[PDB]
Design a protein around this ligand. Sequence first.
Ligand SMILES: [Cu+2]
Ligand SMILES: [Zn+2]
Ligand SMILES: [Zn+2]
Ligand SMILES: [Zn+2]
Length: 168
Amino acid sequence: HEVRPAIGDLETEGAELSLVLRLTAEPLLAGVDLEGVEDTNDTAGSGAVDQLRALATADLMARVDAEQGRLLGPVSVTSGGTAVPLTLDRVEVDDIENPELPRETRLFLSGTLPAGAETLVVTWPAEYGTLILRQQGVEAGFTGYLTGGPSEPITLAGGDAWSHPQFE
Ligand SMILES: [Cu+2]
Ligand SMILES: [Zn+2]
Ligand SMILES: [Zn+2]
Ligand SMILES: [Zn+2]
């Protein structure tokens, strides 16, 4: 199965953080090192991915809800060096019966930023492959190509994050 970048949509509405991950769950659950992987068929866990592909959409979801600790452990948001713990609120899985096609899984993550937050850093592990982190709800917002370790700092919208320059 061709490996595509995960896509992450990050939005803040004051202190409320949403991160929505568009991803392929099957490699992440099988434990496959996705770093420099173009196709899961060229990895040792190919059969493990393909067994996971065979499950119904409801089974895949409950397995994602059941293993969130392992899956989300190395995914972190910090803001001013304070950890911003993420909750898994919701899980979608596309229903594609053709087993030779990958299906998208979406994770809906939320947290609360500290009072007065101005920047956050997202950390994604190299083992999970590329993440294209897009900041939503802002003109000329942050884009990042996360291949392992911390993002560059993401500048936040909203009243708390504003700074008045010393002169106009
Ligand atoms: Cu395959
Ligand atoms: Zn590695
Ligand atoms: Zn939906
Ligand atoms: Zn909004």
